[PDB]
Curated annotation (Swiss-Prot):
Protein name: ATP-binding cassette sub-family C member 9
Extracellular side: 180-190, 288-306, 617-630, 745-837
Keywords: ATP-binding, Glycoprotein, Membrane, Nucleotide-binding, Receptor, Repeat, Transmembrane, Transmembrane helix, Transport
Major place of residence: membrane
Membrane topology category: Multi-pass membrane protein
Organism, scientific name: Rattus norvegicus (Rat)
Whole-protein residues included: 250 to 1511 of 1545
Molecular function GO labels: ABC-type transporter activity; ATP binding; ATP hydrolysis activity; ATPase-coupled monoatomic cation transmembrane transporter activity; ATPase-coupled transmembrane transporter activity; heterocyclic compound binding; identical protein binding; potassium channel activator activity
A GO CC annotation given for this chain: protein-containing complex
Side Cytoplasmic, residues: 107-158, 212-266, 328-595, 652-723, 859-1107
Gene assigned in the entry: Abcc9
An individual GO BP term: vascular process in circulatory system
Amino acid sequence: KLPIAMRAVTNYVCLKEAYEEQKKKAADHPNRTPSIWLAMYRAFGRPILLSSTFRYLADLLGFAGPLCISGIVQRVNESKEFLENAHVLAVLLFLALILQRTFLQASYYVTIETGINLRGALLAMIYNKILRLSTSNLSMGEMTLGQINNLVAIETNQLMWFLFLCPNLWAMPVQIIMGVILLYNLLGSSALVGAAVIVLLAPIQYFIATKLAEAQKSTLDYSTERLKKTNEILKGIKLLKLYAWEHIFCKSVEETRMKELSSLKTFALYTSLSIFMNAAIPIAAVLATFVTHAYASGNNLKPAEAFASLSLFHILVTPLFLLSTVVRFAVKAIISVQKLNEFLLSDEIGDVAIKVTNGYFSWGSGLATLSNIDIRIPTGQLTMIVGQVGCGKSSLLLAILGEMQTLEGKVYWNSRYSVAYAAQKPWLLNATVEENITFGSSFNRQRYKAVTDACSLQPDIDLLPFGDQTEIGERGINLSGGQRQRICVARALYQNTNIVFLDDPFSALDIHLSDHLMQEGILKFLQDDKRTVVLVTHKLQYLTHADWIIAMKDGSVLREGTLKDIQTKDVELYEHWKTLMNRWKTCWWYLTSGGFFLLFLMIFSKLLKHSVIVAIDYWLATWTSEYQTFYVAGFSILCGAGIFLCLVTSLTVEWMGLTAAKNLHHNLLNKIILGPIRFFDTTPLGLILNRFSADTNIIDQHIPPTLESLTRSTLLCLSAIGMISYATPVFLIALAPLGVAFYFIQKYFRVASKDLQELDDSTQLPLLCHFSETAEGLTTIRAFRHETRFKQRMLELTDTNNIAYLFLSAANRWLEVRTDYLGACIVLTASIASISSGLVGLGLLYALTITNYLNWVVRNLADLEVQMGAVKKVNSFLTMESENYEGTMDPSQVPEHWPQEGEIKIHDLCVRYENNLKPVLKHVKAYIKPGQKVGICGRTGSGKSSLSLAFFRMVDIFDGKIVIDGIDISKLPLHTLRSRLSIILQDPILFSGSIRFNLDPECKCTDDRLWEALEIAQLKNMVKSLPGGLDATVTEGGENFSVGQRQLFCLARAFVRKSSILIMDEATASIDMATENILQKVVMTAFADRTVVTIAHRVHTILTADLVIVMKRGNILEYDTPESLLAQEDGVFASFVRADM
Ligand SMILES: CC(C)CCC[C@@H](C)[C@H]1CC[C@H]2[C@@H]3CC=C4C[C@@H](OC(=O)CCC(=O)O)CC[C@]4(C)[C@H]3CC[C@]12C
Ligand SMILES: Nc1ncnc2c1ncn2[C@@H]1O[C@H](COP(=O)(O)OP(=O)(O)OP(=O)(O)O)[C@@H](O)[C@H]1O
Ligand SMILES: Nc1ncnc2c1ncn2[C@@H]1O[C@H](COP(=O)(O)OP(=O)(O)O)[C@@H](O)[C@H]1O
Ligand SMILES: CCC(C)(C)/N=C(\NC#N)Nc1cccnc1
Ligand SMILES: [Mg+2]
Ligand SMILES: [Mg+2]
């Protein structure tokens, strides 16, 4: 598989020991942070020392070119002592070249092996850090899951790509110094002047780098913001699309994109300047050197010296060809390692089964969210935690699990025992249903059936494509909220631990499923195993089953004891409970995105630049053929023209890159955000978000450099071939066999490359997903205490990915070695042809360039093929389906206040989510009067939510009309329909930013109206107490607030719009009973004029409703007042009321 030295385990151990030594040295002195660079050096330097040795040998051998060329020129111009003989020199040059290329490829091999080792070690390090990072980092707003994914995907890769090029950072200096020294032997003091010019690259390239670094950091800043926004949109599209806010958010994404593009433009401008310097300073150096030689030594050079010096200048130019790339990648790698070091230095986690005494706990800020927590959880008994929204229940569970800072007190666990945690926000992995349920336990079919039937999952799984083997979670079929919650509860029930922490498992479930779960699963299955159970529920009806009750109010514990103990001690609390219960083409597209002016300017300017630059060489050769003011002036104007042409050629490629990046991302975002909701239902969020996160990165920062290097190298190679052939025609024959060879090697590489490339991706998507599904659901992993299994899985995945990438690099090395030997053959053939008249001097001169730049032509062509494959995905998404926002209704017919009265009439409505599916709604017909209060109820899977989403045309209608206040909704534009009606979905979708931003993204609401909304939604006091008020922050996903508070914010978001018709879809699922009562009464007293249709989670709420509807499998069974339905003996509605009560 993978050699032991290349396993991620050994590399990780080495790097970790180096980093721990660094941490010791950092602890020694104040303000000295541990550094990743020194740890990486300690761990992996000796390999790089060997690679640098090989590179120095390669450069020493490379200097043999000038000497042999000069000898051949001298001997063409005019035993065993025949080493001057031209043909012997040619063969010796061939041997020197092949030896050089062998050493160079050896250095490349060593460095790629080391870089893969280190990517493995760094991914293991940051993964263990994930398994140790405190969730308060992600909940208080320090960092995001997206930032961690960015680390893993982009920043580690950038560090690796830099470490592929690291030897150059000291090999290129040496080679450029040596060169100058050798020039000093041929040209005398003249070389010094040229040397000085060359040395100016050292100051310059520092300055530029500085700028680049800043410009990069800013980009990485704005990018991270942009992506954040993007992700939220893709995760909350439904809400946005239901509120008509799609474009308000698209505009903010585009603003951040404009900032990122400006930073990218600064980076591109300075990259262009670095290219211009690296190209022109050589021309300036040659100009200075040869003018000084012409006017200092009265004699012109003999041809031998002339071609020797010109060859030495070529050898100088070769490093400067790649200097720009190495500085670019070193800057980006410095930024990436800064981010990695910031991450790796962050905050981390710190009878009676559990006893918390004198506990004061806080969520990081240093202010106590819990206080005077004196609790005990009896062993093998049902503990139930009760309290209104935001009262420290989930906080209590996560405090016992040591997930939050402990200010005072202690938790005793009669080290922690494993405990089955069913998080309130269900976390599902990217494996099958069976893998999610078993979750690392040996499959027992009897126990599996017990769990599955206790959670009623069997009816739902048998529907799925393959019941127990269908892939779930992101990157799989998306289950409903209730199904995911019941799968998570099944996982909690299946693991063979002795403590089960079930956090509100009945939020998404209906009455029947919840009652079945309670009775069978929790009152029979869990008690047969004699397991301790701690339930966090608002269902007061189940308090009779509880053995121990922990009431919580405002962070502290109100009272603790059995029901009788509470009744005798806290009479008021028991009475309160009682009252509450009531007892390719893509490459062409990328090139042409500039409009045919940038493209043709690029091609013509490049051709003209190389024309001038070869004319300079021909001029030097012919000028030294003499051994004059005419020659000097011609040379000077030629050099000036070359410098200006370099300046022009530098900017065109970068400008093309900027233009194409902007256009591609703009089209992608807009077309995505206009897609129908079905597209998001079917497609994983991961694919769409990958487009932006990774492919936009490729399109912005990785295609332009590849393209410019490819164009320069290919023009150099074609020019050298043409020059050689013009000098020696016969070379053309040699070109045909060689040509064939080239073709074939290319061919073979491709058929393998593709395959290997695919493998790489296929092996990396799992790894990334792993890092994603541990960062999410970290608390569940660490509550089951399964960190070891997940670390082992990460090591396995990273080793597989390393194998794939190593084989890919091996194929690349195969192609590079073959093409280098082919270039050496080109050199030898052209050399023999030239030896057997000014033409042939420059012809033989360019043969070395042929090898040097043919390698790069091939490599960059491969890189560009991969990156154009990236571009293809955006261009593919451009073919999506688009929702019909136009609408047939004339805008004149729509009154200024369309839902003026609020009457609705549904006639023969039939709905199916996608073509060729079952009709979820079947001929429903109902007329809600203006100012009517309608309550819709029923089991899960009865089409209540479909009837809700019908009004907003988010479900495709086969037949029927929805005539809202005298206009068929089918005709109106989508935006008018979806802006003048307000829906309160069940799952809260809360964006990042201030409270104000979530309550009105447009900024078009008075502060007074926001306070009104928050007062109806029962969040006035909490927002008042928050530090910033209405400017207080909401971290991504609303994690800093409880679930009930997230739902209440989602209710406030609907109370501000103040439209005439409200559709409340199971809004009080997560809210407790007392908050729910007061909220319903206040909402009814406030919206008494409007028409509100409430899909009810508890039928009690809809007992005081003007009209009631009970849906069963897409049909309205009963349509009448709640009094009439209650009067019926054995009616469905009557049955619902008895069970809930
Ligand atoms: C000109 C000949 C003799 C050698 C050609 C390369 C060298 C000039 C060396 C010496 C100085 C080096 C540069 C000086 C230091 C930097 C900055 C470094 O980035 C940073 O220092 C962080 C940015 C910051 O300091 O705020 C990236 C590498 C780079 C460009 C180095 C790249 C390699 C350089 C150009
Ligand atoms: N992840 C978090 N990070 C920081 N503060 C939090 C976090 N979760 C909750 N809080 C704060 O803790 C306080 C108590 O909320 P808690 O998490 O205990 O909710 P809960 O009572 O379990 O929720 P509910 O019963 O509505 O589902 C709230 O004021 C909230 O501001
Ligand atoms: N996103 C979806 N795509 C296709 N079909 C769906 C989707 N959601 C639900 N359904 C189907 O529609 C029916 C009713 O679902 P739903 O409207 O969610 O019921 P509820 O009223 O309980 O929310 C179910 O039988 C289910 O198969
Ligand atoms: C040394 C600078 C001058 C302009 C005198 N000569 C160059 N400059 C470049 N580039 N010659 C050359 C040609 C082709 C491939 N490599 C090098
Ligand atoms: Mg909770
Ligand atoms: Mg529903």
